[PDB]
Amino acid sequence: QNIDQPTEMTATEGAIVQINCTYQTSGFNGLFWYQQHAGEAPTFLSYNVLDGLEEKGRFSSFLSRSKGYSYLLLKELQMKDSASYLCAVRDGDYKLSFGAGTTVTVRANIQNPDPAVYQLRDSKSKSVCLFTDFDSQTNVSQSKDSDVYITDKCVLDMRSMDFKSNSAVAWSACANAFNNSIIPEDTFFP
Amino acid sequence: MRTHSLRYFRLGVSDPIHGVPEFISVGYVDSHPITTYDSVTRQKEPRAPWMAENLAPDHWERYTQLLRGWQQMFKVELKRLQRHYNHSGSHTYQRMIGCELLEDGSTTGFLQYAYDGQDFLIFNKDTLSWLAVDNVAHTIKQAWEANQHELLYQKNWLEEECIAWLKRFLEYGKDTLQRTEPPLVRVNRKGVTALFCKAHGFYPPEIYMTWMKNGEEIVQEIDYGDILPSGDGTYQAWASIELNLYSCHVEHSGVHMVLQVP
Amino acid sequence: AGITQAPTSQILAAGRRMTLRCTQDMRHNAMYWYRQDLGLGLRLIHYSNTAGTTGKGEVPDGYSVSRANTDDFPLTLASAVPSQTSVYFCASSAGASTGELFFGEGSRLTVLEDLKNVFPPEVAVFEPSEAEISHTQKATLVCLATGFYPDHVELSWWVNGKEVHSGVCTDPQPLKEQPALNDSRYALSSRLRVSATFWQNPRNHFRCQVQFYGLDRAKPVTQIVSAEAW
Amino acid sequence: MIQRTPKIQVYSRHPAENGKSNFLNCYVSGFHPSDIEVDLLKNGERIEKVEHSDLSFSKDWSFYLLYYTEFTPTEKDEYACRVNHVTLSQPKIVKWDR
Ligand SMILES: *[C@@H](C)/C=N/c1c(NC[C@H](O)[C@H](O)[C@H](O)CO)[nH]c(=O)[nH]c1=O
Ligand code: NA
């Protein structure tokens, strides 16, 4: 009748994230964790019904029946761990209830940050502004003007070059595009 | 509280005779039926008015859906057992699950299956394994033990859920289950002379009756009458001896009674 | 052996009958239908513990199911209403008391009072900055899909006729072009990053593909809208 | 395949007194398989107004039932329980021992 888990969690790659789930149900027949990637089906991760910690690769699932509490622990965080994590409880009447899900966002470890705002021209000309190569501690804020559109921060991975970078795109001049966001003082404006 | 128990049985019969259900499942608290379901009604129904009065329609609807699935599971399992044994015709399959809550607060839990009236598979919730009686049961044990999550789920059900259900039902049925109706005890004399110590009108059915000689010696060759339901919710039983000063001793629900025979 | 559901995408006018199909060949006795909505997670609509029976979930009103056989569990919307706009998931498990759920791919359903507000996207590819190339020795291509409704699109990058995933990142969700409007059209961006030397090559071909799931002006049907750069 | 013969016990609800209304019980238990036929008899004739409990289950996998009828015992009237089961070659008749 009540399954609570945080809405969102953010941590850096290589680190740890513990996702808490508290439940209040009439009776208890087990607790499940599922992983759901954006636009994909949920997939089973773990089942706990006795007390204690169960380890499965980089993921651990803990249960305390007397506290009505579980956690899913994600160790040595990888970019591929960004997903929604759902806890679900099978109650005493065998009814399965899901929590709202926790979205986990993994921040890239940016080794050589080189923040800059670039102007990109249309291949069949229109332009867009690209804020890129900033460290993951930089937050990109939405624009005040309704006629100005700014995307969220995205991470791309250039696999063969073993290089990762953050970026946000803006469109409607590039000099004032990301003025509402706290951008570093060393940001390059060509 | 005295010791109490909660039990559920399942009975599956293949090719049953006309009017006989293929599947029946009944719940009990101590000697009292509390619930029933069969393949003809396809509805879980109360067997005690204190169950009907305290469990909302959602309980009966949810467990009816579960029992319709357990019924189909039982039919499939019995058909598979008959194939393993190369058996044709009518065979039976049974299951019994339950728990006890003892007077001292300790608990017990059990789960087992029978095929054609004999022990087939017995669950051990401490080693989390199935005890198989023969080669066919060994094949099933192999499949069931490969599902570790299911074994853990059954251990939790026996140790925690079953006990919580039992405490809940004991409260609903308190006026029946936790009452005491002391026995009405008499001695009758019936060239062989026998003394019969007869008790009736008692609840709970658990009673200890014995014959003693010259105070502290228990008499040899006592015959006992089974503890039988009188049909009104009370029980009756007896103990006899062939004929020294004799006394009948009766122990019921913490009270010891002595009838000295002149 | 698995579970599948169909259609994976549908736009429907309000008042129309619609059936979502779900089939599994795992011999699972228990089947379920869920809807998934922002901030509410998965909510059970209806369930079935075995062939020949069904029960109600948490949100059954406006829906019905049947379970004549083990393999199939169809979900019907007798008269679709806009509040039935959702992502639907079918699932199965060995039993209600045994096993984990196996989910279908999901079916995105959009129920609209009027189909006149549905529009396919416009797609434009923005060429890398010369300033980025000389500063980082890398080149970022930005794709922009704009003015589409509803928000069901699939964006992919194609380099020299082959789909690429490395150096690509797409916005997880489209943004509203008119946040005040309830029938607002959407926009989606994606970036593709390659080495400067790879972009400098005139033989290298880049294409942003946007798959739109759709139905005076052309019919806004399910179509692929693309933009190219050399 | 095991088969278990029923145990058949006939007795009154309350100690019997001639001319006082009582209940005649026939408790049939410990049998296997579950199909069984039980009749209560009065001077060899089958009693029509006979009720019974639902089939009940024991821990040893055997079954039990209680058949009962409201009656007024007389000094001369004879009562019995007639039971048939696969384990019995012929119907077993157990007389009420007053
Ligand atoms: C109403 C509560 C009926 N229950 C019922 C049960 N219930 C106990 C338990 O949930 C079940 O045996 C699970 O399979 C344990 O793993 N059991 C039964 O056999 N019949 C019933 O009517
Ligand atoms: Na016979």
Yes or no: say if A62 and A75 are a contact pair by the CB < 8 Å rule: no
CATH number of the domain within which A173 lies:
2.60.40.10
Range C1-113 classified under CATH 2.60.40.10:
yes
Yes or no: say if C188 and C227 are a contact pair by the CB < 8 Å rule: no
Contact B69 C98 (CB under 8 A): no
How deeply is B113 buried, as exposed, middle or buried, from its count of CB atoms within 10 A (0-12, 13-18, 19+)? buried
Question: What is the identity of the amino acid at A67?
Answer: K
Atom 6, ligand 1: which residue's CA is nearest?
B8
B204 lines ligand 1 (CB under 6 A): no
> Chain A residue closest to C176 (CA)?
A149
CATH number for the domain running over C114-230: 2.60.40.10
User: What distance in Å separates the CA atoms of residue A29 and residue A16, rounded to the nearest whole number?
Assistant: 28
Yes or no: say if B253 and B177 are a contact pair by the CB < 8 Å rule: no
Distance from CA of C96 to the nearest CA of B (A): 7
User: What distance in Å separates the CA atoms of residue B186 and residue B259, rounded to the nearest whole number?
Assistant: 8
Q: Cα dist. A53→A15, A63, A65, A85, B157 in Å?
A: 19, 7, 12, 18, 19
B85 lines ligand 1 (CB under 6 A): no
User: What distance in Å separates the CA atoms of residue A16 and residue A13, rounded to the nearest whole number?
Assistant: 8
Count Cβ neighbours within 10 Å for each residue of B194-209 and write b for 16 or more, e otherwise: ebbbbbbbbbbeebeb
User: What distance in Å separates the CA atoms of residue D82 and residue B56, rounded to the nearest whole number?
Assistant: 42
Cβ contacts of D10 on chain B, cutoff 8 Å = none
Reading the block at residue A89, the tokens are: 């409880």
Tell me the ligand closest to B59's alpha carbon: 1
In this complex, which of B36, B200, B226 lies closest to D9 when CB atoms are compared? B226
Of D93, D27, D98, give the one whose Cα is nearest residue B228. D27
- Look up the domain containing A173 and give its range: 109-190
H or E element at residue A176: helix A174-177
Cβ contacts of C96 on chain B, cutoff 8 Å = 65-66, 69
User: What distance in Å separates the CA atoms of residue A177 and residue A129, rounded to the nearest whole number?
Assistant: 7
Atom 1, ligand 1: which residue's CA is nearest?
B63
CATH number of the domain within which D85 lies:
2.60.40.10
Domain boundary, last residue among A108, A130, A164: A108
Instruction: Please provide residue B140's backbone torsions phi and psi, each rounded to the nearest 5 degrees.
Output: -65, -50
d(CA D87, ligand 2 centre) in Å: 6
DSSP secondary structure, C12-31, as one string: EETT--EEEEEEE-S--SEE
User: What distance in Å separates the CA atoms of residue A98 and residue C59, rounded to the nearest whole number?
Assistant: 13
Contact B156 A95 (CB under 8 A): no
Please name every residue paired with B24 in a beta bridge, in sequence order, or none if there are none: B11, B38
Counting the structural domains of chain A, the total is 2
Is B188 found in the same domain as B91? Answer: no
Please name every residue paired with A165 in a beta bridge, in sequence order, or none if there are none: A156
Is A163 found in the same domain as A118? Answer: yes
Is A178 found in the same domain as A150? Answer: yes
Of A169, A180, A173, A116, give the one whose Cα is nearest residue A143. A180
Question: What is the identity of the amino acid at C165?
Answer: H
Cβ contacts of B20 on chain D, cutoff 8 Å = 34-35
Bridging pattern class, strands B255-260 and B246-252: antiparallel
Contact A92 B155 (CB under 8 A): no
Is A113 found in the same domain as A96? Answer: no
DSSP character at residue A79: G
Instruction: Kindly give, in sequence order, each residue whose CB lies less than 8 Å from that of residue C116, ignoring residues fewer than 6 positions away.
Output: none
Instruction: Kindly give, in sequence order, each residue whose CB lies less than 8 Å from that of residue A45, ignoring residues fewer than 6 positions away.
Output: A32, A33, A34, A35, A56, A59, A61, A72, A85
Is A184 found in the same domain as A99? Answer: no
Atom of ligand 1 nearest to the CA of B9: 19
Q: Where are the domains of chain C?
A: 1-113, 114-230
User: What distance in Å separates the CA atoms of residue B199 and residue B100, rounded to the nearest whole number?
Assistant: 27
Contact B68 C52 (CB under 8 A): yes
D43-46: Cβ within 8 A, 24+ apart: D43/D77, D43/D78, D44/D78, D44/D80, D46/D82
* C-alpha dihedral, C22 to C27 to C32 to C34, nearest 10°: -50
Contact B161/A at CB under 8 A: yes
User: What distance in Å separates the CA atoms of residue C58 and residue C109, rounded to the nearest whole number?
Assistant: 19
Reading the block at residue B181, the tokens are: 């109706």
Of B105, B142, B134, B98, give the one whose Cα is nearest residue B118. B134
Instruction: Kindly give, in sequence order, each residue whose CB lies less than 8 Å from that of residue B235, ignoring residues fewer than 6 positions away.
Output: B200, B202, B203, B204, B205, B207, B227, B228, B229
Cβ contacts of A156 on chain C, cutoff 8 Å = 167-169, 191-193
Distance from CA of B259 to the nearest CA of C (A): 54
CATH number of the domain within which B193 lies:
2.60.40.10
CA B185, distance to chain mean position in Å, is: 26
Is B235 found in the same domain as B165? Answer: no
Counting the structural domains of chain D, the total is 1
User: What distance in Å separates the CA atoms of residue A26 and residue A76, rounded to the nearest whole number?
Assistant: 36
Reading the block at residue B142, the tokens are: 């192999």
Domain boundary, last residue among B150, B179, B208: B179
d(CA A92, ligand 1 centre) in Å: 10
- Look up the domain containing D95 and give its range: 1-98
Is B111 found in the same domain as B62? Answer: yes
d(CA D81, ligand 2 centre) in Å: 15
How deeply is C163 buried, as exposed, middle or buried, from its count of CB atoms within 10 A (0-12, 13-18, 19+)? exposed
Q: Cα dist. A188→A174, C158, D19 in Å?
A: 11, 30, 113
Please name every residue paired with B217 in a beta bridge, in sequence order, or none if there are none: B213
Name chain A's partners: 3 or more CB pairs within 8 A: B, C
Yes or no: say if A16 and A75 are a contact pair by the CB < 8 Å rule: yes
DSSP character at residue C135: H
Reading the block at residue D30, the tokens are: 């410990």
Q: Cα dist. C185→B30, C53, C118, C150 in Å?
A: 66, 43, 9, 7
How deeply is A80 buried, as exposed, middle or buried, from its count of CB atoms within 10 A (0-12, 13-18, 19+)? exposed
Of B256, B205, B206, B253, give the one whose Cα is nearest residue B232. B205
Instruction: Kindly give, in sequence order, each residue whose CB lies less than 8 Å from that of residue D18, ignoring residues fewer than 6 positions away.
Output: D73, D74, D75
Residue C223: CB atoms within 10 Å: 15
User: What distance in Å separates the CA atoms of residue B113 and residue D82, rounded to the nearest whole number?
Assistant: 32
Contact A65/B at CB under 8 A: yes
Is B174 found in the same domain as B205? Answer: no
Q: Cα dist. C109→B136, C215, C225, D95 in Å?
A: 49, 12, 21, 74
Question: What is the identity of the amino acid at C127?
Answer: E
- Collapsing DSSP to helix, strand or coil, C81 comes out as coil
User: What distance in Å separates the CA atoms of residue C49 and residue C62, rounded to the nearest whole number?
Assistant: 21
User: What distance in Å separates the CA atoms of residue B25 and residue B15, rounded to the nearest whole number?
Assistant: 18
CA C181, distance to chain mean position in Å, is: 22
Yes or no: say if D16 and D22 are a contact pair by the CB < 8 Å rule: yes
User: What distance in Å separates the CA atoms of residue C167 and residue C165, rounded to the nearest whole number?
Assistant: 6
Yes or no: say if C208 and C183 are a contact pair by the CB < 8 Å rule: no
Domain boundary, last residue among A58, A91, A108: A108
Q: Please report which residue ranges of chain C form alpha helices under DSSP H.
A: 130-136, 196-200
Atom 3, ligand 1: which residue's CA is nearest?
B63
Distance from CA of A103 to the nearest CA of C (A): 11
Tell me the ligand closest to B58's alpha carbon: 1
Contact A185/B at CB under 8 A: no
Q: Cα dist. A177→A169, C173, C175 in Å?
A: 9, 21, 17
Interface of C with B in 13-42 (CB under 8 A): 29-30
> Annotated binding residue at B235?
no
Judging contact as 3 or more Cβ pairs under 8 Å, the answer for C and D is no
CATH number of the domain within which B148 lies:
3.30.500.10
Yes or no: say if B27 and B117 are a contact pair by the CB < 8 Å rule: no
- Look up the domain containing B54 and give its range: 1-179
Is A23 found in the same domain as A40? Answer: yes
CA B188, distance to chain mean position in Å, is: 32
> Annotated binding residue at B59?
yes
Is A116 found in the same domain as A104? Answer: no
Q: Please report which residue ranges of chain B form alpha helices under DSSP H.
A: 49-52, 57-85, 135-145, 148-156, 162-172, 174-177
Q: Cα dist. C163→C155, C172, C173, C224 in Å?
A: 11, 19, 21, 14
CA D93, distance to chain mean position in Å, is: 9
Yes or no: say if C150 and C182 are a contact pair by the CB < 8 Å rule: no
Is B111 found in the same domain as B3? Answer: yes
Tell me the ligand closest to D86's alpha carbon: 2
Is A115 found in the same domain as A100? Answer: no
Counting the structural domains of chain B, the total is 2
